[PDB]
């Protein structure tokens, strides 16, 4: 729907991204000198609806409470209604860094980049923490770049041109299910790959769902591609038991999703296709390091400890913003 014209200023241009909720759009607006903005427009559509009204209120919320994106949430600008739609303007950000990776060819980031966006991303989802709020669809997908801009330096190792980033500063997007300690919780939360345990066990969740998928994220980051190659719930347990070993017997037995599990253990054979498919494609976690240098090694305690399968025992991002491997950003 381009040439098209929204609360008589600003036009649309081009299409960032599109989803359950609609779509954002790149627009120029005619009335601030013809600088560009993003405009989420949202489905006619009750579910999507409620969504943008609660991420107004957070947005609001957080932008009343850090006005300066100290914290890297993305700043709302205004919103309003058009034919019937919600539409809410925002800054005008870069690629996600799903976008970057995969325009990059899957090639994972470089090791300080991941330092640097993962101290970015640990520091907003905590203040998010602060205020009594979870996130709870953290991805790739919603983390974006300032500015995606970047160098073409040549790398003879992969023999092809790649692409560095000048600035890997990031904002946190997307803030429909963020969801306050004290509101209904959803029952399954977050998308799959980044879904946390106790989400696909259905014990509820809080804040720690979040810290699981960060864990999650950084491991893209690393290798350029998900530890988590599924969509069914019970292979993804058994891909969690490889790369983690075994399950809690005490998640086990609270559990409600007794069809995931044989006596009180996962009803997994590790001799069908689909347990071949996994032990080819998982393994144990600390496997996948590409080198064993001490950097790494931080990383991956890190990572480990965001991967605790028992939420109360799980790292909390407060105590993550202290963790050795954020050290060398001083
Ligand atoms: C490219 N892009 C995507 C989103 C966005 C926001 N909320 C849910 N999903 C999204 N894809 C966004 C928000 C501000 C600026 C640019 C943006």
Redesign the pocket.
Known sequence: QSGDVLSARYEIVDT????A?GK?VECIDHKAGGRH??V?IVKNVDRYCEAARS?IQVLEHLNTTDPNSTFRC?QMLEWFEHHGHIC?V???????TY?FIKENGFLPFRLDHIRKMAYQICKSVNFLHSNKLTHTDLKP??I?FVQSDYTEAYNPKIKRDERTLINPDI?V????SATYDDEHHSTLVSTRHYRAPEVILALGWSQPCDVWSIGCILIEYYLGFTVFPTHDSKEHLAMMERILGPLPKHMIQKTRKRKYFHHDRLDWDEHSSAGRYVSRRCKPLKEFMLSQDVEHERLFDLIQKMLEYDPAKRITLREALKHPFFDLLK
């Not at 960032?16 to 989803?19: I, V, Y």
């Not at 997007?173 to 429909?176: E, H, T, W």
């Open positions: 960032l991204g599109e989803g909720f954002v903005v993003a989420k991420e993305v809410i925002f800054e005008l950000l870069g690629l996600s976008d997908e919603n974006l904002k997007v997307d803030f429909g």
